[PDB]
Design a protein around this nucleic acid. Structure first.
Ligand SMILES: [Mn+2]
Ligand SMILES: [Mn+2]
Ligand SMILES: [Mn+2]
Ligand code: NA
Ligand code: NA
Length: 320
DNA sequence: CGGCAGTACTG
DNA sequence: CAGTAC
DNA sequence: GCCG
């Protein structure tokens, strides 16, 4: 990063807008920040600033104030509420609206939340694991978790295929959670397995709390046996083999990579989701789908890139 | 002016 | 539905 | 916030 002295200050305003609910402005900051993190050289002119995609007038002005002054004065007017809003929205299941409501109602600390707030089932689990869910795990531990889920899955059906996606598959040395994708090449045997799979993972004490228990998605909490172990977030998705390539693409990410590809598909009258790549999609004035189009055959990730006119990228080059 | 990705789950 | 999360 |  040739522009840390700039990016460091912008990230503060980005987080501030984000926890206060100004999501599009925060999105603009996030994009500019990675634009800057990716410039080869330091930014040293206003007109150089505008040269970068994702940096416009208002952002170039801020970068200019920063180098001429070493400071950004907007930093000195950020609401006193922002650190508390960040504290509260780091509870899993509590976002900006819940955080702002708790703040309005007088709560200022997690002790206040614990003793006085009315929590959803999910948020009570989030609070109980507050510290652990802010911690990443070593890659090696993600492997043991993936293998734990796969052994329990293949006990029921040896044909089941399980793959850890997310940051693990992008090759990162540490992982925020473990994202396990499960399918079956027979196109049928994936059905109805969650019941038994999850009950198998509880019987041993591995699965400790459930956050979401859907027909296709499980989100929850696990902990490997023995001393020195933290609770870890675990996500499991079960998909039909027909959708494996698009599900793998989605669940490998990164988030900004997915958003970028899906935005590209839209420009081409196509639609990309965790289910399928579709073409001939009909949309209205506002970019919203009004006609579904046709699913395109995508047996592999490479096919999705190809049909979008893009060169293939291995997972590690998707870490955007 | 207005989109900024597309979807699943919860109550 | 709004809210939240992936 | 940026950009078409
Ligand atoms: Mn993940
Ligand atoms: Mn996850
Ligand atoms: Mn713990
Ligand atoms: Na630009
Ligand atoms: Na949260």
């Amino acid at each position: 990063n040739h522009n840390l002295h700039i990016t460091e200050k912008l990230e503060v305003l980005a987080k501030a807008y984000s926890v206060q609910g100004d999501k599009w402005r925060a999105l603009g900051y996030a994009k500019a920040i990675n634009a800057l993190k990716s410039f080869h050289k330091p930014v040293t002119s206003y007109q150089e600033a505008c040269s970068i995609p994702g940096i416009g007038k208002r952002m170039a002005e801020k970068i200019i104030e920063i180098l001429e002054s070493g400071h950004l004065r907007k930093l000195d007017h950020i609401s006193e509420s922002v650190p508390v809003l960040e504290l509260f929205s780091n509870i899993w299941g509590a976002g900006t609206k819940t955080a702002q409501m708790w703040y309005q109602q007088g709560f200022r600390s997690l002790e206040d939340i614990r003793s006085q707030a009315s929590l959803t089932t999910q948020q009570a689990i989030g609070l109980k694991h507050y510290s652990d869910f802010l911690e990443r795990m070593p890659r090696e531990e993600a492997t043991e978790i993936e293998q734990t889920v796969q052994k329990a899955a293949q006990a029921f059906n040896s044909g089941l295929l399980c793959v850890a996606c997310g940051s693990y598959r992008r090759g990162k040395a540490t992982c925020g959670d473990v994202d396990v994708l499960i399918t079956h090449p027979d196109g049928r045997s994936h059905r109805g397995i969650f019941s038994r799979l999850l009950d198998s993972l509880r019987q041993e004490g591995f699965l400790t709390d459930d956050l979401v228990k859907g027909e296709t998605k499980y989100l929850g909490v696990c902990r490997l046996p023995g001393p020195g172990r933290r609770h870890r977030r675990l996500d499991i998705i079960v998909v039909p083999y027909s959708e494996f390539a698009c599900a793998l693409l989605y669940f490998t990410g990164s988030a900004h990579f997915n958003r970028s590809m899906r935005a590209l598909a839209k420009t081409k009258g196509m639609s990309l989701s965790e289910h399928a790549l579709s073409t001939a999609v009909v949309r209205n004035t506002h970019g919203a789908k009004v006609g579904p189009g046709r699913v395109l055959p995508t047996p592999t990730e490479k096919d999705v890139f190809r049909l979008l006119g893009l060169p293939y990228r291995e997972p590690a080059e998707r870490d955007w």
